[PDB]
Design a protein around this nucleic acid. Structure first.
Lengths: 372, 164, 627, 630
DNA sequence: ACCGGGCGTATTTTTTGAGTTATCGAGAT
DNA sequence: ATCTCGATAACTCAAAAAATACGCCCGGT
């Protein structure tokens, strides 16, 4: 579960409008404009390895398809250790076609053999011998291009901490950074699974992952905006903020998100209105109790009517009908003249106590979401 | 449940503090320094916790006297005699809040109840670091206490259109 | 205008007796001697009744039963005028009299019959004086007759000003008789004031009709804001007037290429307007709640008014903390404060309630005596404000309902041009009503023409200068009044005199404080002041020409305050002679007095005779057959 | 009202002598005899000054040189009140005053300090008299019916005090109707209410009439409108004459269709028309998306304000609860109940509950000390704003494409013109039908105008049951009857002459068999005084016969004997006897302060008349001890 | 961790320049 | 008369600063 961290970190640092591939020729890829995909690999680097040459000489031809990397293709290598042989050292330093060709000549000498006989092909085991033969049999210009601009990556030494650092670098709530990266990596892993369960080359497009990141960031932000705002959330429920009881009732009814925002605004505004009236002395500890008892009685009557009438609709639909009927309902109380939002806010405050409900089984459904 | 906000904005603790400051300001001006009678404590919150009535309590100089405060209600530039008449009714309606105020002000060694149904204020050094709003309300209660003290019972009840 | 008395004639009731003749001296100080309090004031009544009067003020017990007919002989610019009159007997007023016009006649008719009526005599006198047939000759009598009740009396300064109508008419007539305005300008001022009243009323009604009810103003505002949100009409800088908004909407309707310029800016501005409306709704709802609460409490007190007794006296429940405390006590918790039950607690709680009742008894009943409702001014203002605020709140609420409901599913196609056209159809159907409502051009032009005729009347009158002439006239009056006062033995001649018109009196000058005539006594000073001021007024009248006021004055017993005894009256009479002589024998003075013959004979230039007896004595003894 | 002068008080300028009191009696003819020398009575100046007279009439050279605080004691319905005014020093007046109240004033302060001001006491007197109404008769304006200076009492012309000018005369003239009980403050209030309702109903009738006119003129075109509709292809062919109700039914069901399409075949569809339809569908989609997005932006914008207001509310609750912590720090674990002697923790438990609530509010305030929610909110707001920007740009591009298509082609242009016509017509029908419904048989406007008409009619009827003129005539009838009854016993030249009080003239009129004549012409001091006394006493008897009357129940008769005394004394006794009877006729509810020179034997033993060897006037009301020559 | 001493600091108290107002004089109605 | 306007002087409030006693921090047990 380390390649996930590496790919996540580098995609966060990948340029916009990018495309990347996974476990095709390297564990990480990136696409720019033409053939010879640019690649980055993770090593547990080693000059010789059957998997390395295997993947290289296998899907370089697929990497040769256009719209995938500049022919002077960039290349990188993240290694969890400073170990790097002389041949790989020379590869990374190969930033010029001539230097890349010289490095490939050295690779032929050490793995394939000395020109023209090339006898070291037999000196290495058949397994890697045939793969190095395939590597070196291709046009040497393509060998130049595939190692034209090789690089190596060495982070802080702790891939996790670096991942959380780069995530937190973007504008995001620091209280949720951990979860963010977690979810991100998980998605990648799950994605990879479905790409290999169906036996297809797994591809993680930088833009697809970037859109995932945007969607999840917006998801957590909308979760946060529907915070408690009425009581201190419990630390167990603080990891992912749990909206108050009335917001939960609305969600159980399945109202649109914007309607929930309006409900929350009405709740806050009604709370402030009652506070201000008390602070002015207009109302008192008993000027509202008549209001609340009347609200509850009218809600019960409306609930009975809705249950008798809208039974054909589903439970959520009946709840929406009762909700909208109650909020639209307006009875002129004592000569206090309240703004439009006051009565919806009062219903919401009552709903926060489960004394007034929308869903015909709002108690049972609230228990369900509690155990959900 | 809806009442919660009000029960925090008109809590009996603030009422006890206000009543204590009222009594403190009363004996500070009484000619014989006698304690105020109990039925005057029920006219502190209805005057102090109401923002426009409290505004009149605030705008009148400390040396202008209760009459000058009660005479501002009918001024043609204001014309609010109805409020001067509502002081008594509001006191009728806020009986429980005032009573709990005396509760918390006697239990907390703020007002000693002399068995003749009177209230003597103790010293009980001031509260610690309250907000400007509450400090101003306490000062207004003290000013109103001074005013009630300067006059006799009959004069005060007449000037505020009260019926003990 | 020259009008003096030359003589009097008195037809006896019976036929055998022949008229008693009387012949005055024109342009001189005619003096009459006799015994006062014996009816010695009947000649001013006889002159007034001969010159017409709404009632006859001649003593019925002494004089008015021995004479069938009354007569007056008056010299005038036109000539000598002989006027007659018939006593009513049982009635009070008579329209029967005989007239004779001449230049200088010597024939004295002995038997008469009705030849003219009151109206004809009055109007011929009026156009003799050139008045608007509005002043009249009778209204000038105030400056001719000074009866005993008025000669020395600090509060009445002119004859027969003891009635609202009379003093008001004389008040409104000073501006004319003071020689500072003409009758035509008087009518101009009257009509000007009438049109001022009409203009003010109609302008108030115009401002009433011009202002639109809040509902329709809200509808137009919401429609304009809708159009603005779509980019049709650009965002105004400030609140547009109803007409401007209608104009711009009509322009938008007339277009053909409707380019909906919907952007972030328009939607954001609409939402900002929505939030501003929300703020204003909160504020207005709070204030309306306050006002409504005040109103219901006022209504409760006024209900108690009728509830308590037969008459009006509002009732409010007593504090009764003594009783209220036990009201909350029950058999479960004795203490209504801590909430506990205990016998000792119960008994001491009882003791406390009796102590509280004792305390309340000190001022208990005293606070239940006549608590009225003085908050009627407050009630009216609060009801007005409640109505106005309810209207305004409903307007704002409808506007905000539109702006919100225009975000749920109504716009679901609105931003589509196919639906923007539908919106424009709606607005150009509503513009008809929104043009009808609150739009008026007939009343604005009516007010404009009223103002224009007001301006014409102002220019014609040339006001702000007549009062300057009045100020100059009264200054001259005061100057010559002080001049005369120097001749009168007043106890403080150093103090000037001002004729204060607005009260129909004189405001005595004083350094310690402004003083009136009624403030201080000294009837001698009262008579001196009347003499000085009246002769000042007559001098000022004769200073100009064509003055409606006559040029003759009558004083009745200007010596009753002296009932050493001769020096004061001598001073007054010599001053009167001086003023008359310096007037060039055009002003006539008739002074009935009780002073002996020589008392007024000592004056140089004043003539009279110890004849002329007034009262029952004026009637020849042969006519006097009894009481 | 019941308002009598129990006594006068004076405070010497030199604080060496106790205040001097002159105690009258209540419900008796308080005679102040003696004072052979008559500079002028200061009782009236003192009483008016203490009652709020604009300027000080107290003798400057004789009294203001020794008195610091003038004062009176007045018995009222509220109970005795001591009203005192500081000497104005070197000014025409000073607003400084002192006031005391009690059920029975017994003590008198030795020294006085400012306690109120003239305006406040004037208002207090007014609302004693119920004259704090909507411009209205003021207490001071009633000085006419309670003062009779030495001149006014016997002056044949001036019948009421403060009738010496234009403004005062017209004043008193306008106040008479209110005093007599015709114009009631209730009636003035009803008149003002009726005026305002008249204005409101005028505007409402104007607006309703205009709206109904618009509705009627539109409905006249209803059949032509429906013909236009069927022409446009929005309704089927009307086979037979239709009914207004079902025509309207067709119209609103037409306008209500979510997506109404023109009656055009699709088999022969041009490329331009298909492109137009596709663009219009894209337009519908983008419009709906932008509608929802605007919904969200609205809710976010108002939720920001909601959070801010909740923050402020929490701060206020925390401020109002904070003191609970300190008030708990000083509360013992239990306490003894003040009123039931129970050693219970009820106070302590309630302080604990309040501290719990303060803890809750404190947790709420600091729930997000790290301002993460504000940052998330702002980022989401930016998201919605940029998303709306993109949607509006897309809509603008769509409309540009549509306009280019229509401009280039002509069949598409005709189609757009036709659909524009149809939509415009539908919108016109929508607005017209909305107005027609607004003018329904029970809509708001019709009912409002109807009820305002009913209100105006009811107020007019209410005013018409109670007629001003009938009330005034009845009041003057009783006043004249009582005045004549009083006069017959009193000495007048003929004791059988009915009289009439002319309010406009402000004078009595003797309706004699020979001549209905004013008091001004009858020349006699005795008769002038008799008529003054008769009319004033009848006035006050009538006043006390009424209820809620604003005139004081006291009368100052200054020098009611100057007419005699350049024997006649018998006549004076008659006068006084009459006064006595009057005072005793209403159980002593009326008080008379009679400044007089009549020796004590004139009225020695007549009921209701009181006099003391004290009660001097002029300068002896100022003790000579205070007198030192200043 | 609890008690006691020494240093830091928020609150009270004192101070103070600015600002606000009850009162008065004069005027107007 | 009541009401308003303006001039005045005195008042109180409010902000800043200083002194204060409280709370926080450091050292020893």
């Amino acid at each position: 579960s380390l390649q996930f961290t590496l790919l996540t970190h580098l995609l966060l640092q990948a340029p916009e409008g990018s495309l990347c591939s996974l476990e095709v020729l390297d564990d990480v890829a990136q696409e720019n404009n033409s053939g010879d995909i640019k690649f980055i690999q993770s090593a547990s680097a080693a000059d010789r390895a059957k998997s390395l040459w295997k993947t290289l000489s296998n899907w370089i031809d697929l990497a040769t398809s256009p719209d995938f990397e500049v022919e002077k293709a960039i290349f990188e290598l993240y290694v969890s250790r400073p170990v790097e042989g002389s041949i790989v050292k020379k590869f990374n330093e190969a930033k010029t076609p001539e230097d890349a060709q010289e490095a490939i000549t050295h690779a032929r000498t050490e793995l394939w053999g000395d020109s023209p006989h090339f006898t070291l092909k037999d000196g290495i085991s058949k397994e890697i011998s045939k793969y190095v033969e395939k590597v070196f049999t291709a046009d040497q210009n393509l060998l130049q291009r595939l190692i034209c601009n090789f690089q190596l990556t060495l982070g802080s030494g702790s891939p996790q901490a670096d991942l959380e650092a780069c995530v937190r670098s973007h504008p995001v709530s620091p209280s949720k950074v951990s979860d963010i990266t977690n979810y991100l990596c998980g998605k990648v892993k799950r994605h990879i699974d479905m790409l290999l369960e169906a036996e297809k080359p797994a591809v993680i497009a930088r833009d697809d992952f970037y859109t995932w990141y945007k969607a999840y960031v917006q998801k957590i932000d909308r979760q946060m905006v529907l915070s408690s705002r009425a009581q201190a959330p419990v630390k167990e429920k603080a990891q992912e903020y749990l909206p108050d009881k009335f917001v939960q009732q609305l969600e159980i009814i399945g109202l649109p998100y914007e309607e929930i925002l309006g409900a929350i605004s009405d709740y806050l505004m009604a709370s402030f209105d009652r506070t201000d009236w008390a602070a002015r002395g207009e109302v008192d500890e008993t000027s509202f109790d008549d209001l609340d008892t009347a609200l509850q009685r009218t809600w019960k009557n409306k609930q009975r009517i809705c249950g008798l009438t809208h039974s054909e609709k589903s439970e959520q639909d009946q709840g929406k009908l009762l909700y909208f009927e109650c909020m639209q309902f307006n009875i002129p109380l004592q000569a206090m003249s309240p703004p439009s939002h006051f009565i919806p806010g009062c219903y919401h405050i009552l709903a926060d106590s489960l004394a007034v409900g929308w869903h015909p089984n709002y108690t049972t459904q609230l228990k369900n979401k509690k155990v959900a | 449940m809806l009442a919660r906000e009000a029960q925090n904005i008109q809590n009996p603790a603030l009422g006890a503090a206000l009543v204590w400051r009222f009594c403190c300001g009363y004996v500070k001006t009484n000619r014989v320094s006698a304690p105020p009678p109990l039925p005057f404590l029920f006219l502190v919150l209805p005057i102090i916790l109401h923002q426009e009535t409290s505004e009149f309590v605030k705008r009148t100089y400390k040396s202008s006297g209760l009459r000058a405060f009660a005479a501002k209600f009918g001024d043609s530039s204001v014309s609010k005699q109805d409020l001067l008449f509502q002081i008594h009714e509001r006191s009728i309606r806020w009986r429980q809040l005032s009573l709990r105020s005396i509760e918390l002000a006697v239990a907390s060694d703020l007002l000693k109840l002399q068995d003749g149904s009177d209230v003597i204020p103790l010293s009980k050094t001031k509260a610690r670091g309250l907000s400007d709003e509450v400090k101003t309300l306490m000062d207004l209660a003290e000013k109103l206490g001074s005013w009630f003290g300067e006059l006799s019972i009959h004069e005060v009840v007449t000037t505020l259109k009260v019926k003990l | 205008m020259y009008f003096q008395i030359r003589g009097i004639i008195l037809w006896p009731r019976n036929k055998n007796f022949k008229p008693h003749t009387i012949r005055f001296e024109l342009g001189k100080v005619n003096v009459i001697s006799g015994a006062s309090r014996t009816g010695k004031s009947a000649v001013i009544p006889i002159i007034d009744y001969c010159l017409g009067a709404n009632t006859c003020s001649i003593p019925v017990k002494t004089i008015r039963k021995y004479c069938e007919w009354f007569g007056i002989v008056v010299a005038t610019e036109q000539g000598e005028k002989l006027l007659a009159r018939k006593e009513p007997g049982n009635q009070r007023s008579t329209t029967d009299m005989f007239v004779l016009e001449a230049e200088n006649i010597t024939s004295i008719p002995i038997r008469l019959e009705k030849n003219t009526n009151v109206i004809a005599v009055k109007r011929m006198l009026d156009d003799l004086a050139n008045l608007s047939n509005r002043p009249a000759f009778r209204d000038l009598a105030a400056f001719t007759f000074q009866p005993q009740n008025v000669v020395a009396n600090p509060d009445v300064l002119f004859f027969k000003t003891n009635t609202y109508e009379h003093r008001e008419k004389l008040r409104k007539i000073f501006p004319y008789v003071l020689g500072a305005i003409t009758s035509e300008l008087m009518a101009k001022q009257f009509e000007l004031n009438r049109i001022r009243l009409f203009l003010r009323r109609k302008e108030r009604e115009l401002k009433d009709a011009q202002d639109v009810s809040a509902q329709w103003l809200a509808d137009l505002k919401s429609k304009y804001s809708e159009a603005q949100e779509l980019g049709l009409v650009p965002k105004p800088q400030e609140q547009l007037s109803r007409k401007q908004m209608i104009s711009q909407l009509e322009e938008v309707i007339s277009r053909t290429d409707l380019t909906l310029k919907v952007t972030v800016s328009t939607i954001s501005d609409a939402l900002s307007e929505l939030n501003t409306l929300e703020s204003e709704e909160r504020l207005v709802s709070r204030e309306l709640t306050t006002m409504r609460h005040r109103l219901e409490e006022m209504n409760r007190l006024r209900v108690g008014m009728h509830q308590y007794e037969n008459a009006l006296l509002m009732q409010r429940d007593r504090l009764k903390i003594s009783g209220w405390l036990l009201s909350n006590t029950n058999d479960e918790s004795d203490c209504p404060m801590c909430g506990s039950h205990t016998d000792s607690a119960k008994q001491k709680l009882q003791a406390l309630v009796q102590r509280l009742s004792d305390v309340e008894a000190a001022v208990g009943a005293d606070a239940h005596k006549e608590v009225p409702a003085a908050f009627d001014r407050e009630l009216q203002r609060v009801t007005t404000e409640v109505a106005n605020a309810t209207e305004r709140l409903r307007a704002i609420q409808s506007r905000k309902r539109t702006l919100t409901s225009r975000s749920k599913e109504a716009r679901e196609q609105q931003f589509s041009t196919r639906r923007a056209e539908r919106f424009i159809g709606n607005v150009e159907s509503a513009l008809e009503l929104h043009r009808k409502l609150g739009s008026d051009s007939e009343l604005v032009e009516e007010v404009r023409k009223l103002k224009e005729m007001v301006q014409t009347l102002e220019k014609e009158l040339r006001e702000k200068d007549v009062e300057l002439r009045k100020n100059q006239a009264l200054r001259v009056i005061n100057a010559q009044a002080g001049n005369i006062l120097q001749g009168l033995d007043v106890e403080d001649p150093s103090a000037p005199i001002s004729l204060e018109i607005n009260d129909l009196t004189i405001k005595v000058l004083g350094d310690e404080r402004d003083d009136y005539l009624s403030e201080i006594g000294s009837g001698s000073n009262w008579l001196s002041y009347h003499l000085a001021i009246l002769l000042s007024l007559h001098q000022f009248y004769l200073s100009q020409k064509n003055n409606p006021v006559p040029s003759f004055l009558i004083l009745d017993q200007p010596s009753q305050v002296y009932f050493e005894d001769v020096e004061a009256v001598r001073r007054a009479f010599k001053a009167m002679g001086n003023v008359v002589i310096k007037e060039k024998g055009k002003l006539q003075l008739i002074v009935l007095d009780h002073a002996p013959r020589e008392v007024w004979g000592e004056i140089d230039g004043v003539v009279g005779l110890p004849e002329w007896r007034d009262g029952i004595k004026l009637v020849p003894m042969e006519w006097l057959t009894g009481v």
